[PDB]
Coordinates of C-alpha atoms in Angstrom, one line a residue:
Chain A
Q281 CA -119.7 -111.8 132.0
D282 CA -121.8 -114.2 129.8
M283 CA -119.6 -117.3 130.2
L284 CA -119.3 -116.5 133.9
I285 CA -123.1 -116.4 134.3
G286 CA -123.5 -119.6 132.3
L287 CA -121.0 -121.4 134.6
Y288 CA -122.6 -120.0 137.7
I289 CA -126.0 -121.1 136.7
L290 CA -124.6 -124.5 135.8
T291 CA -123.0 -124.9 139.2
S292 CA -125.8 -123.5 141.3
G293 CA -127.1 -126.7 143.0
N294 CA -130.6 -127.6 144.1
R295 CA -132.9 -125.9 146.6
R296 CA -131.5 -126.9 150.0
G297 CA -134.1 -126.6 152.7
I298 CA -137.6 -125.0 153.1
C299 CA -137.4 -123.8 149.5
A300 CA -137.7 -127.5 148.4
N301 CA -140.3 -128.8 150.8
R302 CA -143.5 -127.0 152.0
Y303 CA -143.9 -129.2 155.1
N304 CA -141.3 -130.5 157.5
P305 CA -139.9 -134.0 156.7
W306 CA -140.1 -135.0 160.3
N307 CA -143.9 -135.3 160.0
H308 CA -144.4 -138.8 161.3
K309 CA -146.6 -140.2 158.6
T310 CA -146.4 -141.6 155.0
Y311 CA -144.4 -144.5 156.6
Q312 CA -146.6 -147.1 154.8
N313 CA -147.2 -147.9 158.4
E314 CA -148.3 -151.3 159.7
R315 CA -146.9 -154.2 161.7
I316 CA -144.9 -155.6 158.7
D317 CA -142.8 -154.0 155.9
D318 CA -145.1 -155.5 153.2
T319 CA -146.9 -152.4 152.0
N320 CA -146.9 -150.1 148.9
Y321 CA -143.2 -149.3 148.1
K322 CA -142.8 -146.2 145.8
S323 CA -139.9 -144.4 147.5
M324 CA -139.4 -141.9 144.7
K325 CA -136.2 -140.7 146.4
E326 CA -133.6 -139.6 143.8
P327 CA -132.1 -141.4 140.7
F328 CA -129.2 -143.7 141.2
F329 CA -127.2 -143.2 138.0
Chain B
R56 CA -146.8 -89.2 123.7
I57 CA -145.7 -89.2 127.3
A58 CA -144.1 -86.1 128.9
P59 CA -141.2 -86.8 131.1
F60 CA -141.3 -86.9 134.9
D61 CA -144.8 -88.4 135.3
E62 CA -144.0 -89.5 138.9
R63 CA -145.4 -86.2 140.1
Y64 CA -149.0 -87.2 139.9
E65 CA -148.5 -90.5 141.7
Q66 CA -145.9 -92.8 143.1
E67 CA -144.6 -95.3 140.5
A68 CA -146.9 -93.8 137.8
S69 CA -144.9 -95.2 134.9
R70 CA -145.3 -98.7 136.3
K71 CA -149.1 -98.2 136.5
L72 CA -149.3 -96.8 133.0
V73 CA -147.2 -99.7 131.5
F74 CA -148.9 -102.5 133.4
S75 CA -152.4 -101.2 132.8
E76 CA -151.7 -100.8 129.0
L77 CA -150.3 -104.3 128.9
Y78 CA -153.3 -105.8 130.7
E79 CA -155.7 -103.9 128.4
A80 CA -153.8 -105.1 125.3
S81 CA -153.9 -108.7 126.7
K82 CA -157.6 -108.5 127.5
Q83 CA -159.0 -106.7 124.4
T84 CA -157.0 -109.1 122.1
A85 CA -157.0 -112.5 123.8
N86 CA -153.2 -112.9 124.1
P87 CA -152.7 -114.1 127.7
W88 CA -148.9 -114.0 127.3
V89 CA -148.7 -110.2 127.0
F90 CA -149.4 -109.6 130.7
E91 CA -148.4 -112.7 132.7
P92 CA -149.7 -112.0 136.3
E93 CA -146.7 -113.6 137.9
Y94 CA -143.8 -111.7 136.3
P95 CA -145.5 -108.7 134.6
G96 CA -143.9 -107.5 131.3
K97 CA -142.1 -110.8 130.8
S98 CA -143.1 -113.9 128.9
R99 CA -141.7 -117.3 128.1
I100 CA -140.4 -117.4 124.6
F101 CA -139.3 -120.6 122.7
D102 CA -136.2 -121.6 120.9
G103 CA -136.1 -121.2 117.1
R104 CA -133.9 -124.2 116.5
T105 CA -135.0 -126.7 119.2
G106 CA -138.7 -126.0 119.9
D107 CA -137.9 -125.7 123.6
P108 CA -138.9 -122.9 126.0
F109 CA -136.0 -120.9 127.5
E110 CA -136.1 -121.8 131.2
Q111 CA -136.7 -118.3 132.4
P112 CA -139.2 -115.6 131.2
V113 CA -137.8 -113.0 128.9
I114 CA -138.7 -109.3 128.5
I115 CA -140.0 -108.6 125.0
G116 CA -141.2 -105.4 123.5
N117 CA -141.4 -103.1 120.5
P118 CA -138.7 -100.4 120.9
Chain C
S15 CA -125.5 -76.5 177.2
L16 CA -123.8 -75.0 174.2
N17 CA -121.2 -73.2 176.4
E18 CA -119.3 -76.3 177.4
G19 CA -118.6 -77.9 174.1
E20 CA -119.8 -79.9 171.1
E21 CA -120.4 -83.3 172.8
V22 CA -119.0 -83.3 176.3
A23 CA -120.3 -84.6 179.7
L24 CA -122.6 -82.1 181.3
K25 CA -121.3 -81.4 184.8
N26 CA -122.1 -77.7 185.1
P27 CA -124.8 -76.9 187.7
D28 CA -127.9 -75.2 186.5
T29 CA -127.3 -77.0 183.2
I30 CA -128.2 -80.5 184.6
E31 CA -131.4 -78.8 185.8
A32 CA -132.2 -77.7 182.3
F33 CA -131.5 -81.2 181.0
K34 CA -133.5 -82.7 183.9
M35 CA -136.4 -80.2 183.3
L36 CA -137.1 -81.5 179.8
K37 CA -139.4 -84.1 181.4
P38 CA -142.8 -82.6 182.3
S39 CA -143.2 -85.0 185.2
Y40 CA -140.0 -83.5 186.7
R41 CA -141.4 -80.0 186.4
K42 CA -144.5 -81.2 188.3
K43 CA -142.2 -82.6 191.0
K44 CA -140.3 -79.3 191.2
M45 CA -143.3 -77.1 191.5
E46 CA -145.2 -79.3 194.0
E47 CA -142.1 -79.6 196.2
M48 CA -142.0 -75.8 196.2
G49 CA -145.8 -75.5 196.2
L50 CA -147.5 -72.6 194.3
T51 CA -149.9 -75.2 192.9
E52 CA -150.7 -74.9 189.2
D53 CA -151.6 -71.8 187.2
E54 CA -148.9 -70.0 189.2
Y55 CA -145.9 -72.0 188.3
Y56 CA -146.7 -70.8 184.7
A57 CA -147.0 -67.2 185.7
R58 CA -143.7 -67.0 187.6
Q59 CA -141.5 -67.1 184.4
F60 CA -142.9 -63.7 183.2
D61 CA -141.3 -61.9 186.2
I62 CA -138.9 -59.1 185.5
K63 CA -135.3 -60.2 185.9
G64 CA -132.5 -57.9 186.9
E65 CA -132.5 -54.8 189.2
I66 CA -135.9 -54.9 190.7
Chain D
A262 CA -126.4 -118.9 129.7
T263 CA -128.8 -119.4 126.9
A264 CA -130.8 -122.4 127.7
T265 CA -131.5 -121.0 131.1
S266 CA -131.6 -117.4 129.8
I267 CA -131.9 -114.2 131.9
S268 CA -133.6 -110.9 131.4
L269 CA -134.3 -107.7 133.3
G270 CA -137.9 -106.6 133.8
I271 CA -139.5 -104.2 136.2
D272 CA -140.4 -106.4 139.1
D273 CA -137.0 -108.1 139.3
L274 CA -135.6 -104.8 140.7
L275 CA -136.6 -105.9 144.2
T276 CA -136.5 -103.1 146.7
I277 CA -135.9 -104.4 150.3
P278 CA -139.2 -104.6 152.2
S279 CA -138.2 -102.3 155.1
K280 CA -137.5 -99.2 153.0
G281 CA -141.2 -98.2 153.5
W282 CA -140.5 -97.6 157.2
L283 CA -137.0 -96.3 157.2
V284 CA -137.6 -93.5 154.7
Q285 CA -140.8 -92.5 156.5
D286 CA -139.0 -92.4 159.8
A287 CA -136.1 -90.5 158.3
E288 CA -138.6 -87.9 157.0
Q289 CA -140.2 -87.5 160.4
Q290 CA -136.9 -86.5 162.1
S291 CA -136.2 -84.1 159.2
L292 CA -139.7 -82.6 159.7
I293 CA -139.3 -82.3 163.5
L294 CA -135.8 -80.8 163.4
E295 CA -136.6 -78.3 160.7
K296 CA -139.7 -77.4 162.8
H297 CA -137.6 -76.9 165.9
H298 CA -134.9 -75.0 163.9
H299 CA -137.5 -72.3 163.5
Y300 CA -138.1 -72.3 167.2
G301 CA -134.5 -71.6 168.1
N302 CA -133.9 -75.0 169.7
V303 CA -131.0 -75.8 167.4
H304 CA -128.7 -73.7 165.3
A305 CA -127.8 -73.8 161.6
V306 CA -124.8 -76.2 161.9
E307 CA -126.8 -78.8 163.8
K308 CA -129.5 -78.8 161.1
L309 CA -126.8 -79.1 158.4
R310 CA -124.9 -81.8 160.4
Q311 CA -128.0 -84.0 160.7
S312 CA -129.7 -83.8 157.3
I313 CA -126.5 -85.2 156.0
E314 CA -126.3 -87.9 158.6
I315 CA -129.8 -89.5 158.5
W316 CA -129.8 -90.0 154.8
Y317 CA -126.2 -91.3 154.8
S318 CA -126.9 -93.7 157.6
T319 CA -130.2 -94.8 156.0
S320 CA -128.7 -95.2 152.5
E321 CA -125.8 -97.2 153.9
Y322 CA -128.1 -99.4 155.9
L323 CA -130.2 -100.4 152.9
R324 CA -127.0 -101.1 150.9
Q325 CA -125.7 -103.5 153.6
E326 CA -129.2 -105.2 153.9
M327 CA -129.5 -105.7 150.1
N328 CA -127.6 -109.0 149.7
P329 CA -129.1 -110.6 152.9
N330 CA -132.5 -109.8 151.5
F331 CA -131.6 -111.1 148.1
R332 CA -129.7 -114.2 149.4
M333 CA -132.6 -115.4 151.5
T334 CA -135.9 -114.5 149.8
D335 CA -135.0 -114.4 146.1
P336 CA -131.7 -116.1 145.5
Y337 CA -132.2 -116.3 141.8
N338 CA -133.3 -112.7 141.1
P339 CA -131.8 -111.6 137.7
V340 CA -130.2 -108.5 139.3
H341 CA -128.7 -110.7 142.1
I342 CA -127.3 -113.3 139.7
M343 CA -125.7 -110.7 137.5
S344 CA -123.9 -108.9 140.3
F345 CA -123.3 -111.6 143.0
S346 CA -121.7 -114.0 140.5
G347 CA -119.3 -111.2 139.7
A348 CA -120.2 -110.9 136.0
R349 CA -121.3 -107.3 135.7
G350 CA -122.6 -104.8 138.2
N351 CA -121.2 -103.5 141.5
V352 CA -123.1 -103.7 144.8
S353 CA -123.1 -99.9 144.7
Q354 CA -124.4 -99.9 141.1
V355 CA -127.3 -102.3 142.0
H356 CA -128.0 -100.0 144.9
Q357 CA -128.9 -97.2 142.4
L358 CA -131.6 -99.3 140.7
Chain E
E214 CA -148.9 -134.3 174.1
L215 CA -147.4 -131.4 172.1
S216 CA -149.1 -128.1 173.1
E217 CA -152.2 -126.7 171.4
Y218 CA -150.1 -126.0 168.4
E219 CA -149.9 -129.7 167.8
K220 CA -146.4 -128.3 167.2
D221 CA -147.3 -126.8 163.9
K222 CA -143.7 -125.7 163.8
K223 CA -142.7 -129.4 163.9
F224 CA -145.1 -130.1 161.0
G225 CA -145.0 -126.8 159.0
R226 CA -148.6 -125.7 158.9
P227 CA -149.4 -122.0 159.0
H228 CA -149.1 -120.6 162.5
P229 CA -148.2 -117.3 164.2
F230 CA -144.5 -116.7 164.8
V231 CA -145.2 -115.7 168.4
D232 CA -146.8 -118.0 170.9
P233 CA -150.5 -117.3 171.4
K234 CA -150.3 -118.7 174.9
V235 CA -148.2 -116.0 176.6
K236 CA -148.5 -112.8 174.4
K237 CA -147.8 -110.7 177.4
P238 CA -148.7 -107.0 176.6
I239 CA -146.6 -104.0 177.2
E240 CA -146.0 -102.6 180.7
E241 CA -147.0 -99.0 180.1
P242 CA -143.8 -97.5 178.6
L243 CA -143.1 -93.7 178.6
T244 CA -145.9 -91.8 177.0
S245 CA -145.6 -88.8 174.6
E246 CA -145.1 -86.2 177.4
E247 CA -142.2 -88.0 179.1
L248 CA -140.2 -88.2 175.9
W249 CA -137.6 -85.8 174.6
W250 CA -138.7 -83.6 171.7
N251 CA -136.9 -85.8 169.1
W252 CA -139.2 -88.8 169.7
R253 CA -142.6 -87.2 170.0
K254 CA -145.0 -88.2 167.1
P255 CA -146.3 -84.7 167.0
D256 CA -150.0 -85.5 167.7
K257 CA -151.1 -84.6 164.1
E258 CA -150.4 -87.3 161.5
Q259 CA -148.1 -85.9 158.9
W260 CA -148.6 -86.4 155.1
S261 CA -145.8 -88.5 153.6
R262 CA -145.4 -89.9 150.1
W263 CA -144.6 -93.3 151.7
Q264 CA -148.0 -93.6 153.5
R265 CA -149.7 -96.1 151.1
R266 CA -148.4 -99.6 151.0
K267 CA -146.5 -100.6 147.8
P268 CA -148.9 -102.5 145.4
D269 CA -146.5 -105.4 144.7
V270 CA -147.3 -108.8 143.1
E271 CA -147.0 -111.4 145.9
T272 CA -149.4 -109.4 148.1
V273 CA -152.0 -110.2 145.5
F274 CA -151.3 -113.9 145.4
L275 CA -151.2 -114.2 149.2
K276 CA -154.7 -112.6 149.3
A277 CA -155.8 -114.7 146.3
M278 CA -155.2 -118.1 147.8
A279 CA -156.1 -117.0 151.4
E280 CA -159.7 -117.3 150.2
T281 CA -159.2 -120.8 148.7
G282 CA -157.9 -122.3 152.0
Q283 CA -154.3 -122.8 150.8
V284 CA -153.2 -119.9 153.0
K285 CA -153.9 -119.0 156.6
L286 CA -153.0 -115.4 157.1
Chain F
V299 CA -102.2 -150.3 186.1
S300 CA -105.7 -151.8 186.5
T301 CA -108.9 -150.4 185.0
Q302 CA -109.1 -147.6 187.6
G303 CA -109.7 -143.9 187.1
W304 CA -110.2 -141.2 187.2
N305 CA -108.9 -138.3 185.1
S306 CA -105.1 -138.8 185.3
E307 CA -103.0 -140.0 182.4
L308 CA -100.2 -141.5 184.5
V309 CA -97.0 -141.8 182.5
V310 CA -94.9 -144.9 182.2
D311 CA -91.2 -145.0 181.8
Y312 CA -91.1 -148.6 180.5
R313 CA -91.3 -149.6 176.9
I314 CA -93.9 -152.3 176.3
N315 CA -93.9 -154.6 173.2
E316 CA -96.8 -153.7 170.9
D317 CA -96.7 -157.0 168.9
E318 CA -99.1 -158.4 171.5
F319 CA -101.2 -155.2 171.9
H320 CA -103.9 -153.7 169.6
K321 CA -102.8 -150.9 167.3
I322 CA -105.7 -148.4 167.4
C323 CA -104.7 -145.4 165.2
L324 CA -106.5 -142.1 166.0
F325 CA -105.9 -138.4 165.2
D326 CA -104.4 -136.9 168.3
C327 CA -103.6 -140.1 170.2
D328 CA -102.9 -143.8 169.9
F329 CA -104.7 -146.1 172.4
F330 CA -103.3 -149.5 173.2
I331 CA -105.3 -152.5 174.4
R332 CA -103.8 -156.0 175.0
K333 CA -104.5 -158.6 172.4
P334 CA -104.8 -162.2 173.7
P335 CA -103.9 -164.9 171.2
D336 CA -106.8 -165.9 168.9
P337 CA -107.2 -167.3 165.4
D338 CA -108.7 -164.1 163.9
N339 CA -107.7 -161.2 166.2
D340 CA -111.1 -161.0 168.0
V341 CA -110.4 -160.6 171.7
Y342 CA -109.8 -157.4 173.7
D343 CA -108.5 -157.9 177.2
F344 CA -109.0 -154.3 178.5
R345 CA -107.3 -154.4 181.9
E346 CA -104.1 -152.6 180.9
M347 CA -104.3 -149.7 178.4
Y348 CA -101.7 -147.1 177.3
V349 CA -102.3 -144.0 175.2
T350 CA -99.5 -142.2 173.4
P351 CA -99.3 -139.2 171.0
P352 CA -99.4 -140.3 167.3
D353 CA -96.4 -142.5 166.6
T354 CA -94.5 -141.9 169.8
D355 CA -92.8 -144.3 172.2
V356 CA -93.8 -142.4 175.4
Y357 CA -96.5 -144.5 177.0
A358 CA -99.2 -143.5 179.5
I359 CA -102.4 -145.1 180.8
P360 CA -105.5 -143.4 179.5
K361 CA -108.4 -141.9 181.5
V362 CA -111.2 -144.2 182.5
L363 CA -114.7 -142.6 182.8
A364 CA -116.7 -145.8 183.2
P365 CA -116.3 -149.4 184.3
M366 CA -114.6 -151.7 181.8
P367 CA -114.9 -155.5 181.3
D368 CA -112.6 -157.8 183.3
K369 CA -113.0 -160.8 180.9
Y370 CA -112.2 -161.7 177.3
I371 CA -114.8 -160.0 175.0
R372 CA -115.0 -160.5 171.3
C373 CA -116.0 -157.1 169.9
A374 CA -115.8 -155.1 166.7
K375 CA -113.7 -152.0 165.9
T376 CA -115.4 -148.9 164.3
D377 CA -114.3 -145.3 163.5
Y378 CA -115.6 -141.8 163.0
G379 CA -113.8 -139.9 160.3
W380 CA -114.2 -136.8 158.1
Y381 CA -111.8 -137.1 155.1
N382 CA -110.4 -133.6 155.0
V383 CA -110.0 -132.6 151.3
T384 CA -108.1 -129.4 151.7
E385 CA -106.4 -128.1 148.4
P386 CA -102.6 -127.7 148.8
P387 CA -100.6 -125.1 146.8
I388 CA -99.1 -126.0 143.4
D389 CA -95.3 -125.5 143.2
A390 CA -94.2 -127.5 140.1
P391 CA -96.1 -129.1 137.2
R392 CA -98.0 -132.3 138.0
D393 CA -98.3 -131.3 141.7
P394 CA -101.4 -132.7 143.3
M395 CA -104.6 -130.6 143.1
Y396 CA -106.1 -131.9 146.3
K397 CA -105.3 -133.6 149.6
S398 CA -107.0 -136.3 151.6
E399 CA -106.4 -137.9 155.0
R400 CA -108.8 -139.6 157.5
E401 CA -109.4 -137.8 160.8
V402 CA -110.8 -140.6 163.0
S403 CA -112.1 -139.0 166.2
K404 CA -114.1 -141.8 167.9
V405 CA -113.6 -145.6 167.9
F406 CA -116.7 -147.4 169.1
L407 CA -116.2 -151.0 170.1
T408 CA -119.4 -153.1 169.9
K409 CA -119.5 -156.5 171.8
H410 CA -120.6 -159.6 170.0
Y411 CA -123.7 -161.4 171.1
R412 CA -122.3 -163.6 173.9
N413 CA -119.0 -163.6 172.1
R414 CA -119.8 -165.8 169.1
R415 CA -117.5 -166.5 166.1
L416 CA -117.0 -164.5 162.9
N417 CA -118.2 -167.2 160.5
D418 CA -120.8 -169.1 162.5
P419 CA -124.4 -168.8 161.2
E420 CA -125.5 -166.9 164.3
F421 CA -123.7 -163.6 163.9
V422 CA -125.3 -160.8 165.8
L423 CA -123.7 -157.6 167.3
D424 CA -124.5 -157.0 171.0
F425 CA -125.4 -153.3 170.8
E426 CA -126.1 -153.0 174.5
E427 CA -122.4 -152.6 175.4
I428 CA -120.4 -150.1 173.3
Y429 CA -117.2 -148.4 174.4
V430 CA -116.1 -145.0 173.0
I431 CA -112.5 -144.0 172.5
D432 CA -112.2 -140.3 172.2
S433 CA -109.3 -138.5 170.5
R434 CA -109.8 -134.8 171.5
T435 CA -109.5 -135.8 175.1
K436 CA -107.9 -139.2 175.5
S437 CA -110.5 -141.3 177.5
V438 CA -112.6 -144.4 177.2
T439 CA -116.3 -144.3 178.0
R440 CA -119.1 -146.8 177.9
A441 CA -122.0 -145.8 175.6
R442 CA -125.6 -145.2 176.9
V443 CA -127.5 -146.8 174.0
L444 CA -131.3 -146.5 174.1
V445 CA -133.9 -149.0 172.9
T446 CA -137.3 -147.8 171.6
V447 CA -138.4 -151.2 170.4
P448 CA -141.6 -152.3 172.1
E449 CA -140.3 -155.8 172.6
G450 CA -137.9 -154.4 175.2
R451 CA -135.6 -156.9 176.9
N452 CA -137.1 -160.0 175.2
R453 CA -136.7 -159.6 171.4
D454 CA -135.0 -161.0 168.4
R455 CA -131.4 -159.8 168.1
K456 CA -131.2 -160.7 164.4
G457 CA -131.6 -157.1 163.3
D458 CA -132.1 -154.1 165.6
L459 CA -130.9 -151.1 163.6
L460 CA -128.7 -148.8 165.7
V461 CA -128.7 -145.0 165.1
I462 CA -125.8 -142.8 166.1
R463 CA -126.1 -139.0 165.9
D464 CA -124.3 -135.7 166.6
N465 CA -120.6 -136.0 167.4
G466 CA -121.0 -139.6 168.6
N467 CA -123.2 -138.7 171.6
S468 CA -126.7 -139.9 171.0
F469 CA -127.3 -143.7 170.7
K470 CA -130.6 -145.3 169.8
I471 CA -131.7 -148.8 168.7
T472 CA -134.7 -149.2 166.4
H473 CA -136.3 -152.1 164.5
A474 CA -134.5 -152.6 161.1
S475 CA -137.8 -152.2 159.2
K476 CA -138.1 -148.5 160.1
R477 CA -134.7 -147.4 158.7
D478 CA -134.6 -143.9 157.4
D479 CA -133.8 -143.2 153.8
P480 CA -130.5 -141.5 152.9
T481 CA -132.4 -138.5 151.4
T482 CA -134.8 -138.1 154.3
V483 CA -132.0 -137.7 156.9
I484 CA -130.2 -135.1 154.7
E485 CA -133.4 -133.3 154.0
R486 CA -134.4 -133.4 157.7
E487 CA -131.4 -131.4 159.0
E488 CA -131.5 -129.0 156.0
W489 CA -135.2 -128.2 156.8
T490 CA -134.6 -127.7 160.5
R491 CA -131.3 -125.7 160.2
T492 CA -132.7 -123.4 157.5
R493 CA -136.0 -122.8 159.2
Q494 CA -134.1 -121.2 162.1
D495 CA -132.1 -119.0 159.7
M496 CA -135.3 -117.8 157.9
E497 CA -137.0 -117.1 161.3
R498 CA -133.9 -115.3 162.5
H499 CA -133.7 -113.2 159.4
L500 CA -137.4 -112.3 159.6
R501 CA -137.3 -111.5 163.3
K502 CA -135.9 -108.0 162.6
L503 CA -139.0 -106.9 160.7
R504 CA -141.6 -104.7 162.4
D505 CA -144.4 -107.1 161.7
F506 CA -142.8 -110.3 163.0
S507 CA -145.2 -110.5 165.9
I508 CA -148.3 -110.4 163.6
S509 CA -147.2 -113.0 161.0
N510 CA -147.7 -116.6 160.0
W511 CA -146.7 -119.2 157.4
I512 CA -143.8 -121.5 158.2
Chain G
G197 CA -120.3 -89.6 139.8
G198 CA -121.1 -87.5 142.9
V199 CA -121.1 -90.5 145.2
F200 CA -117.7 -91.9 146.3
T201 CA -116.2 -94.2 148.9
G202 CA -115.0 -92.8 152.2
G203 CA -115.6 -93.2 155.9
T204 CA -118.7 -93.9 158.0
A205 CA -119.7 -94.1 161.7
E206 CA -121.1 -97.0 163.9
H207 CA -124.7 -97.2 165.0
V208 CA -126.6 -99.6 167.2
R209 CA -130.1 -100.5 166.3
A210 CA -132.8 -102.2 168.4
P211 CA -133.0 -106.0 168.1
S212 CA -136.8 -105.9 167.9
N213 CA -139.9 -104.1 169.3
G214 CA -139.8 -103.8 173.1
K215 CA -139.1 -101.6 176.1
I216 CA -135.7 -100.2 176.8
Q217 CA -134.7 -100.7 180.4
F218 CA -131.4 -99.8 182.1
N219 CA -129.9 -97.8 185.0
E220 CA -130.1 -94.1 184.2
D221 CA -127.7 -93.4 187.1
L222 CA -124.5 -94.6 185.5
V223 CA -124.6 -92.3 182.5
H224 CA -123.9 -88.6 182.2
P225 CA -126.0 -86.1 180.5
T226 CA -124.9 -84.7 177.1
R227 CA -125.8 -82.9 173.9
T228 CA -125.4 -84.6 170.6
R229 CA -123.8 -83.0 167.5
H230 CA -127.3 -83.1 166.0
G231 CA -128.7 -81.0 168.9
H232 CA -130.5 -83.8 170.8
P233 CA -130.2 -84.8 174.4
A234 CA -128.4 -88.1 174.9
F235 CA -126.3 -90.1 177.5
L236 CA -122.6 -90.6 177.5
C237 CA -121.6 -93.9 179.1
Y238 CA -118.0 -94.3 180.2
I239 CA -118.4 -98.0 181.2
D240 CA -120.0 -101.2 179.8
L241 CA -123.7 -101.0 180.3
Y242 CA -126.3 -103.7 179.6
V243 CA -129.4 -102.1 178.2
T244 CA -132.2 -104.8 178.1
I245 CA -135.2 -104.8 175.8
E246 CA -138.3 -106.8 176.9
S247 CA -139.4 -108.1 173.6
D248 CA -142.4 -110.0 175.0
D249 CA -141.0 -113.5 175.2
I250 CA -137.3 -112.5 174.6
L251 CA -134.9 -110.5 176.7
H252 CA -132.4 -109.2 174.1
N253 CA -129.3 -107.8 175.8
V254 CA -127.6 -104.9 173.9
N255 CA -123.9 -104.4 174.4
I256 CA -122.8 -100.8 174.8
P257 CA -119.1 -100.2 174.9
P258 CA -117.7 -97.1 176.7
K259 CA -117.6 -93.6 175.0
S260 CA -121.0 -94.3 173.6
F261 CA -123.9 -91.9 173.0
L262 CA -127.1 -93.6 174.2
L263 CA -130.0 -91.7 172.5
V264 CA -132.9 -93.3 174.4
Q265 CA -134.4 -93.0 177.9
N266 CA -135.5 -95.5 180.4
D267 CA -138.8 -97.4 179.9
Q268 CA -139.0 -96.0 176.3
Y269 CA -140.7 -98.0 173.6
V270 CA -138.6 -98.6 170.6
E271 CA -139.3 -99.9 167.1
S272 CA -137.6 -102.8 165.3
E273 CA -134.8 -101.1 163.5
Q274 CA -134.0 -97.7 164.8
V275 CA -130.8 -96.1 166.1
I276 CA -130.7 -96.1 169.9
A277 CA -127.0 -95.6 170.7
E278 CA -123.9 -94.4 168.9
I279 CA -120.8 -96.6 169.3
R280 CA -117.8 -94.3 169.2
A281 CA -116.9 -90.6 168.6
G282 CA -118.7 -88.9 165.7
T283 CA -117.9 -86.0 163.4
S284 CA -118.0 -86.0 159.6
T285 CA -116.7 -89.7 159.5
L286 CA -113.2 -89.0 158.2
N287 CA -109.6 -88.5 159.2
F288 CA -108.6 -84.9 160.1
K289 CA -110.2 -81.5 160.7
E290 CA -110.8 -78.5 158.4
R291 CA -112.6 -75.2 158.8
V292 CA -115.7 -74.2 156.8
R293 CA -118.2 -71.3 157.0

């Protein structure tokens, strides 16, 4: 029981879909949009260990 | 001193009693962790040997 | 409808009528097609049945 | 299992949302049939054979709708994690709470 | 363009599940008289223990931030 | 045995040397295209093709569903694979705990820009012409790539990002500046596919008509 | 204790709110074991429900026990037709008073 619950919680993954984003990621916006690619570049994305 | 089968007066009467008493205890004595209004009856306790909060709220009481 | 069986197809005549008469709109159709208007279709069920 | 921690409160016992309607509708048919049983419309066996069947069908419908409710709205409910992971607690046992 | 929704489904803003552009009403189904005695709703509302909505916690938060504009019920 | 159609895989009773052909390994078939001599194996004379079951000597011309080139085109070879990772049974100690094999199902062939060289400082893929080699149903088809770039016909070919999609069917060309992040594409399909499931699950509730919030 | 594992029966519930529509001519009147009027169907019917924008088709196999009439309003989840047979949902017969 206890070790099983620990291992299940460990291997449970992230939140897949609508439980991780309130709004749709289609949402054509936040592109840092202009005629050139020289804008603010944050791109939090995910770590690249 | 609660007689058994208090669910005759109401529906979920024990829940009302417990939650109202918890809220009154949290309000009269300013202890906002007694009645957390997002998971009532539970609170987030810390670790005695790391100073870290256990990730999920834990039910505490005085049995 | 209890003479036939527990759950069987109702093919007996005068039993389909009982099943079909559960709808009040059908009772209206039955009485108007025979006539007698209203207030008399109610009073014709109290008649003595048997050796008149 | 410690750092994350789990515990059982009162609001983690998550009754499925549709129980409010199913039990109410089950009571209506039990009220109507027991009212017609006094009118001679049905006999004793039919009343017995139905009061066993509404509450068996309704109870077995809530039981089969428990996991789909848990697995879509509250995937990390403490009762769900304890039983769905296979640690302790049957599906039937959770159905009692 | 994309409807009067602005396709709120495509964006994710609060919006009714059904389309408020057809919403075609019912077509006068059978009324109480033309129904068998098992489905009748016997014309006098019956007392039942399950007649008041369950208090619940999230029904309080949904009403709480509906006033603050974060929720469109 | 020209580049004719239509939906007949005519068999051939003559063995043909494959040391002058192109070995295109697929899952349920093995397409063959003639290889004219060249320094770096970069010409595909289509004309005569032959498709065979995987590693079999029985030859047969494939099914042609679109016109094919009649000249020497320098193109590139792609693939569309899954890497099945099924876990086999364990019989003896030290037996493998997992398996792996590619399942190439579509071999797109993208023409070079006016058939340039491999090392010349003008390398650009010509994304207009792409030919699809299926595996489930042995056949060769020309792609129907689409261009949303406002420049249209007159544009710079030194970077026009191409997007392929579900099962090698959709084909779009977009400016290389507006390339989607790896996380955004994954999150996009997850959001769309799980919003249908949530709506489908909630459809059975009595209050679904009068509702809101997704 | 008191509750065990045994047999059940099959029920068909409405896909959603709507208006049951079908041909009342192909079914043959009956009386359910609960004492209610119903409809035996010996063939494959296609009962349709006009759920405003949707036209959910319900599949009814033969030897079923349609419990609903034509043009009858139905709620979301509510039994409208039994699938097969009936009885106390078990194997073989006994005799009780």
